[PDB]
Amino acid sequence: ATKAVCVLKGDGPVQGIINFEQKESNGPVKVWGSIKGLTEGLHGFHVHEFGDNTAGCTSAGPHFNPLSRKHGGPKDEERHVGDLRNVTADKDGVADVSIEDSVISLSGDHCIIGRTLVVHEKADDLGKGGNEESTKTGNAGSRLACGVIGIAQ
Amino acid sequence: ATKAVCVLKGDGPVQGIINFEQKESNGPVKVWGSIKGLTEGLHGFHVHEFGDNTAGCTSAGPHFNPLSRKHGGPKDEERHVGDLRNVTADDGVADVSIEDSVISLSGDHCIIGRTLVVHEKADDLGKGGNEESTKTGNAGSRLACGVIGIAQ
Ligand SMILES: [Cu+]
Ligand SMILES: [Cu+]
Ligand SMILES: [Zn+2]
Ligand SMILES: [Zn+2]
């Protein structure tokens, strides 16, 4: 298998760790881990194009989109390769994450290794938002923390 | 003209930015940038196997060595792909500027998604005669490290 990990850090209280795991060549990527310091509710969660943090998460670029598609998230509807929908923070401010994805990958042409993982302020409306914005970012608002996705043991 | 960048963040007063640039695939890689907060003198400078920073820099693993070789200097034939000799600091500042055709931002020796580590001590280039020397050049602990990501 191939493994990756990402330490999410930000300007404020938000911080966490996310693990990625791809058991088979271009198979699904198990994504689990936890993020703390978030306000109760939903937070956009995506992979952006650059693993550049010279300017915090801002320099991370737009959502990872190798196949010029619209933003989204839902099953078989159009989307960006980096759109991981939303993570949920309980009342403690901690969001336990456990999702599985078949579009992202840890090897090949949709490789997310060396790219940034971002957790946002608001919820991602998956592109159901009516306004140019919803098809770009899902109106997920600002970025609270991020990290470069790297190869793990 | 593929590019990569790295922000040597993480605990400590040691912060900096290192850019990686490689025009044509598998060709040389130009490495340059600045680091500050360092102790004066020579500091080992290497690419380690993992971009895992969960427990600070201890989780990056050993040097990025895909050919199973002993630690060495970049001009030695006997080196880890990740060995990039030493960087000098004066006030704790070190201006970096190097080339290396063994590492790469594409293919077999891609350092993307891995960790760039600058050590507390000088790297002895693997000529000590002890195990450490053939593993990390005796460069000491890891003052700072950052995962190498894809830059604009
Ligand atoms: Cu995002
Ligand atoms: Cu090292
Ligand atoms: Zn998107
Ligand atoms: Zn080495």
Curated annotation (Swiss-Prot), chain A:
Outcome (variant: residue 133 to Q): Abolishes dimerization
PTM comment, free text: The ditryptophan cross-link at Trp-32 is responsible for the non-disulfide-linked homodimerization. Such modification might only occur in extreme conditions and additional experimental evidence is required. Palmitoylation helps nuclear targeting and decreases catalytic activity.
Consequence of changing residue 43 to R: In ALS1; reduces structural stability and enzyme activity; increases tendency to form fibrillar aggregates
Residues recorded as bearing N6-acetyllysine in the entry: 122, 136
GO biological process: action potential initiation; anterograde axonal transport; apoptotic process; auditory receptor cell stereocilium organization; cellular response to ATP; cellular response to cadmium ion; cellular response to potassium ion; determination of adult lifespan
Gene Ontology MF terms: copper ion binding; identical protein binding; protein homodimerization activity; protein phosphatase 2B binding; protein-folding chaperone binding; small GTPase binding; superoxide dismutase activity; zinc ion binding
Protein name: Superoxide dismutase [Cu-Zn]
Organism per entry: Homo sapiens (Human)
Curated annotation (Swiss-Prot), chain B:
Residues linked to a lipid group, S-palmitoyl cysteine type: 6
Cross-link (1-(tryptophan-3-yl)-tryptophan (Trp-Trp) (interchain with W-33)): 32
Chief place of localization: cytoplasm
Gene Ontology MF term list: copper ion binding; identical protein binding; protein homodimerization activity; protein phosphatase 2B binding; protein-folding chaperone binding; small GTPase binding; superoxide dismutase activity; zinc ion binding
Enzyme class: oxidoreductase
Effect of residue 54 to R: In ALS1; reduces tendency to form fibrillar aggregates
Name of the protein in question: Superoxide dismutase [Cu-Zn]
Organism: Homo sapiens (Human)
Encoding gene per record: SOD1
